[PDB]
Symmetry: D2
Subunit: 121 residues, 4 copies
C-alpha cells in the first residue's frame, strides 16, 4: 500500500512504491484541491468547463488526476479507481501526474492526497 501527495506543479509526477503486475487488481482514492493556474482550485476530476488545450491526458479534464503505469500512456484516475484492472500488456511502477499542458506547470498550486492498494484477486 502507498500513501503520499501529488503536487500540481510537478510536471515529472510523483512515483509510488506500487508496481502493477499483470493480473493485479488495485484501488485508488484521491482527494484534495489543486489549480492549473487560476486562483480557485478544483477537485481530482478537474475543471469540466475548461477545454483540452493539449493536456498530457486527453481522456480527462484539465486539473484532473492521471497516472502512468511504467512506460504506458496516461490513464484517467480522477477521484479514484475501484477494484480496477489495467489493459493488456500494461505493467510497471505507478506514477501519479497532475493533468496539465506540458511546460506550463510553473504556475500550478495545491496537491492531491492519494491512497493506493492492491485488492485480492
Amino acid at each position: 500500500a502507498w500513501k503520499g501527495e501529488v503536487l500540481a506543479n510537478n510536471e515529472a509526477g510523483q512515483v509510488t512504491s506500487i508496481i502493477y503486475n499483470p493480473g493485479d487488481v488495485i484501488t485508488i482514492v484521491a482527494a484534495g484541491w489543486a489549480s492549473y493556474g487560476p486562483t480557485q482550485k478544483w477537485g481530482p476530476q478537474g475543471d469540466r468547463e475548461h477545454p483540452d488545450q493539449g493536456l498530457i491526458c486527453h481522456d480527462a479534464f484539465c486539473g484532473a488526476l492521471v497516472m502512468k503505469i511504467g512506460n504506458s500512456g496516461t490513464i484517467p484516475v480522477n477521484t479514484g479507481l475501484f477494484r480496477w484492472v489495467a489493459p493488456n500488456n500494461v505493467q510497471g511502477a505507478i506514477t501519479l501526474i497532475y493533468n496539465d499542458v506540458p511546460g506550463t506547470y510553473g504556475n500550478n498550486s495545491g496537491s492531491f492526497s492519494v491512497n493506493i492498494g492492491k485488492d485480492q484477486s
Copy 2:
C-alpha cells in the same frame, strides 16, 4: 458490493445494500457531477468556496457526498473512503446523501456514481 446513483435532488438519500457491521472495513469511490442549485456542477468534494448555510453535514462542503450508517449523524465521504473503519457503536444500513440544506433539494441536479465494498479484515 454495491453500485448505483445518488441524485442531488434526493433529500431522503439513496439507500444501499451494504450494512456496516462492527469491525468491518469498507471502501468507497465516488465520481460524477452535481449542483446544489446553480448552473455549474461540482465534484463529490463539493463547493469549497460556498459557505455553510445549514448543511445536513457541517464537516463537508455544500454539494459534497455524505452518508449515514443506520441512524447516526452524517459522515463525510467526499471522493471516497480507503479501507476505512467507522467509530464505535456505529452500525446499520449505509445511506448515501447529497450534502445540502434541508428543504432546498428542489433545484438540485446531477448525480454521483458510487461504488461500495468491504475489504478483508
Copy 3:
C-alpha cells in the same frame, strides 16, 4: 483477523473474536496434529478409517475440525475454507470445535492451529 489453537480435549470449543454477519465472506486455514483417543494423530480432516459413532458433526470424519456459527448446527471445516459464504439465514459468532463424540473428549490430545479472517466482498 483471528489466530488461535483449538484443543482436542476442549468439548465446548474455542470461541473466536470473529462474528459472522449475513453476506460476509471468510477464509480459514487449519494445521496441526490431534487425536480422538489413540496414540496416533491425524490432520484437520480427521481419520477417514473410523466409523461415525455419534459425532457432533456427521458430515465430517472423527478428529476433524468443525465449527458452529452462533446457535446453528455444526459445519465442516477440515483444512479450512477459501472465500466461503455461509448458508441461508446463518449468522452469529464463530466457535471452532474438535469433532468427536459428546463426553469422550476426556482422553483427547493435540491441537489445531487456525487462522480466520474476513475476506473482501
Copy 4:
C-alpha cells in the same frame, strides 16, 4: 485466483496461473487425500510416521503438499498458507508438487484440491 487438482503421480509438479511478485500476499487452502504408495491415504500434511528417504522437500513430511516459486527451493505448503509473504528475493511462477522421492511417483494415487489467491497488500 487459481483452482485445480494436484495429482500425486505428477512428478514435475502442477503449474498454476499464479505468478508471485515481490510484496505480494497470498492464501492457499489444500484439501483431499493422496498416497505415496500404500493403499491408505493421508492428508495434505502427509504421513508423519514415514521417514525421509530422500524427499524433494526435507521440511515437510512425505506425501505432503509443497510448492516451488520461480527458481527457489521447495517450500512446505501442507494444509495451506494464510495471508503469506514469500521470503526475501522470492519471485516467479508457482508450481504445486506432491512431496516425494525423485523417480518413485510411479505408484502414487489420489490428488489434492487446491485454491490460490492474492490477498490485499
